[PDB]
């Protein structure tokens, strides 16, 4: 092996913790967490401490790629005497063999730490393992991939567990919410990377000035690996870099990453984009690509927060209400288009049209400043709640079908306003001696206690029984529960 055969990112890789750039707080927190790991296992993780690290036996590092998560993890692993072990998605990771291996390795000692050196007074921890998992977000979605298996692994283990992923808040990563201590590595500061670039430039005889690293890391968006690769790629031809050719370099190395459904909502509802000047800079093709970055949450977010802005593109003689009405009309048209898309015939070739009608046109109608905060779309939770209520109403209707002889909606609209007066009202106006009447009325339609509980949740407006059931004396409720349980 020679020197010119490795990339600049490998020959300038950090050899110790004192050369990492930025995120000093995170690396110190993880170092303290790994240091007190045996102090945490000797008392079974009950004492968390002042740092709050010690109750969780696993640590999950999450942040953008290329900021030094894996590097810092490996560095602290070699520095604290822990015998390092790495396994990731590049190797086979399933529910069958990965689970078996990790289970056999959670409370087994290392032979490498035993045979290498075990006689000097270095540490009693060399016999231990540190299972460092990389690309945790790269596993398969289902349980067969091993994400839930690893989540359960982070609950029962005698060796420190280190998890490293690039994307944290994902559905697949939901089980890791309350099981492992979360550490977030953030965008590094400009000074440390500036000094590192100064050093790596003076070492390679690369002419470079301090005025350009700011724009460089701005267009790179906090990625030291990409910056190093950029310098290694362009330093071979252009020996001296300055403020003359930096424009072409920034335009050719623009990081094209898809935005989250929250930044997409900010860019869509930005009034400067739709101005006469901003139109010829962020063209309509870019606006459609914005929606195509995430075409599942963009229309919902747009419909949620299109009427929560202050418009700055109002035509002369048009109020905010008119623009909101036109935006809602286009939202309805885009909804019709989406229904035509995600139905039979699979008219997916209409996806670009759904880009304009659902997101682009309503946002353009009410583009401007953001008044409050970008609120997440509540249509998902409302749909889930409506589905649960529909399932409950279906159970109630199929229980009462033997007597009602009506439909689901016909039972919800008209029958429930009378079932409320029949079941619950005798409890408020008669006391605890009206239990038998309610029991007979419920058995007349084969109702259950769970059905009685679910019935009182359908009413709204001036009839909210959530406090009426609490106003009922607890004696009557206990007597009813005991009577129905006999």
């Amino acid at each position: 092996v020679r020197e010119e055969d490795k990339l600049w990112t490998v020959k300038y890789a950090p050899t110790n913790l004192q050369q990492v750039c930025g995120n000093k707080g995170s690396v110190m927190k993880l170092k303290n967490w790994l240091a007190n790991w045996e102090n945490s296992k000797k008392n079974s993780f009950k004492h968390a401490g002042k740092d709050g690290s010690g109750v969780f036996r696993a640590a999950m590092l999450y942040g953008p790629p290329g900021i030094g998560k894996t590097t810092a993890a490996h560095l602290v692993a070699q520095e604290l005497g822990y015998d390092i072990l790495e396994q990731n998605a590049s190797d086979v990771r399933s529910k069958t063999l990965l689970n078996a291996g990790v289970k056999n390795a959670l409370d087994n000692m290392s032979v490498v730490g035993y045979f290498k050196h075990n006689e000097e007074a270095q540490n009693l921890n060399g016999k231990h393992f540190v299972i460092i998992m990389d690309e945790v977000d790269g596993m398969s979605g289902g349980d067969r991939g091993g994400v839930g298996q690893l989540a359960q692994f982070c609950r029962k283990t005698s060796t420190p567990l280190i998890l490293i992923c690039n994307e944290r808040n994902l559905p697949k990563m939901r089980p890791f919410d309350r099981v492992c201590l979360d550490i977030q590595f953030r965008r590094p500061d400009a000074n440390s990377i500036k000094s590192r670039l100064m050093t790596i430039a003076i070492r390679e005889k690369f002419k470079l000035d301090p005025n350009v690293i700011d724009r460089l890391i701005q267009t790179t968006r906090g990625d030291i690996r990409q910056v190093i690769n950029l310098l290694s790629t362009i330093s071979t031809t252009t020996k001296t870099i300055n403020h003359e050719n930096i424009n072409e370099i920034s335009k050719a190395w623009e990081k094209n990453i898809a935005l989250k459904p929250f930044d997409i909502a900010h860019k869509m509802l930005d009034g400067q984009i739709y101005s006469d000047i901003g139109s010829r800079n962020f063209t309509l093709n870019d606006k459609i690509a914005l929606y195509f970055d995430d075409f599942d949450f963009t229309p919902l977010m747009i419909q949620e927060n299109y009427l929560s802005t202050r418009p700055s593109v109002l035509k002369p003689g048009q109020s905010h209400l008119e623009a909101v009405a036109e935006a809602a009309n286009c939202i309805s048209l885009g909804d019709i288009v989406e229904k035509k898309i995600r139905s039979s015939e699979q008219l997916w070739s209409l996806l670009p049209l759904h880009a304009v009608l659902s997101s682009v046109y309503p946002a353009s109608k009410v583009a401007g400043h953001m008044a409050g905060r970008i609120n997440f779309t509540a249509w998902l939770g409302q749909n889930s709640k409506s589905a649960k209520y529909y399932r409950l109403l279906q159970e109630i209707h199929y229980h009462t079908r033997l007597g009602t002889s009506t439909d689901k909606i016909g039972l919800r609209l008209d029958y429930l306003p009378t079932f409320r007066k029949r079941l619950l009202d005798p409890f408020l106006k008669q006391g605890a001696d009206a239990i038998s009447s309610v029991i007979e009325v419920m058995d007349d339609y084969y109702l259950t206690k769970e059905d009685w509980d679910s019935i009182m949740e359908f009413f709204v407006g001036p009839d909210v029984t959530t406090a009426i059931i609490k106003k009922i004396p607890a004696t009557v409720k206990s007597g009813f529960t005991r009577k129905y349980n006999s």
Partner: protein
């Protein structure tokens, strides 16, 4: 260069088949004394050592101790093509980039020359130290294999209890438990059980590693089992000129 001629290719075939389900990349160091191969498991739990002496080859040749990085899957693919009655010859030239395998038939002149590309195994060579063992026993390899195959069907943890000249193999799983009791009986005089017990030892191993070790139950008739309370247990299969050893680390004796 190097030119090592085997007696029967089946010997090397069984040798590779013994420890090919635990490790994948192995460094074979060939010196004037013979072949030495140490391989760490991907989980760094089970270390495999293998020694083949100069008196196990029909003809041995070596001008310099050379390391060969081999993938056991491709090596098994190459060795599977041979028959039981051929002479196997490993050949390596200067600047080793590949290894040649000659399968020469004895009743004909049909020669089968295969090539196997070497790998870059950036692994450090460690040192193996022999120490006193509190218990050292021997028993037929097939019987131990069947005990492991019977106990692994309940759990992945096997508790070994050597106490009062009795061997206790315990498997505590989800659906019941399993126990196997062994008393040393020295009688055929070859299928006996030779056991020396100094200290009563209590260890716990992984059933998967035990299965991967007993998969090599074709190189000998019995297994040499050496136990230690603070050292990894030694499972040995003896050869005509070498051995195949597994240094399996016990679990946490909390």
């Amino acid at each position: 260069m190097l030119e090592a001629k085997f007696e029967e290719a089946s010997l090397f075939k069984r040798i590779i088949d013994g420890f090919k389900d635990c490790v994948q990349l192995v460094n074979f160091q060939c010196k004037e004394d013979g072949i030495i191969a140490q391989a760490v498991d991907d989980s760094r739990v089970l270390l495999v050592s293998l020694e083949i002496g100069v008196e196990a080859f029909q003809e041995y040749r070596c001008d310099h101790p050379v390391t060969l990085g081999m993938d056991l899957t491709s090596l098994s693919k190459i060795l599977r093509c041979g028959n039981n009655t051929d002479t196997l010859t490993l050949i390596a030239d200067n600047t080793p980039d590949s290894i040649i395998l000659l399968f020469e038939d004895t009743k004909k002149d049909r020669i089968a020359e295969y090539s196997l590309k070497l790998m870059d195994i950036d692994a450090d060579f460690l040192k193996i130290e022999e120490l006193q063992y509190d218990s050292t026993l021997s028993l037929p390899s097939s019987e131990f294999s069947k005990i492991v195959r019977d106990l692994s069907q309940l759990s992945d943890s096997i508790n070994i209890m050597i106490t009062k000249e009795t061997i206790k193999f315990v498997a505590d799983g989800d659906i019941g438990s399993g126990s196997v009791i062994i008393k040393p009986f020295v009688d055929h005089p070859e299928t006996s059980i030779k056991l020396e017990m100094d200290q009563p030892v209590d260890l716990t191993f992984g059933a998967k590693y035990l299965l991967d070790i007993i998969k090599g139950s074709s190189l000998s008739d019995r297994v040499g089992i050496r136990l230690s309370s603070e050292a990894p247990a030694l499972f040995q299969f003896d050869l005509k000129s070498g051995f195949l050893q597994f240094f399996l680390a016990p679990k946490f004796n909390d």
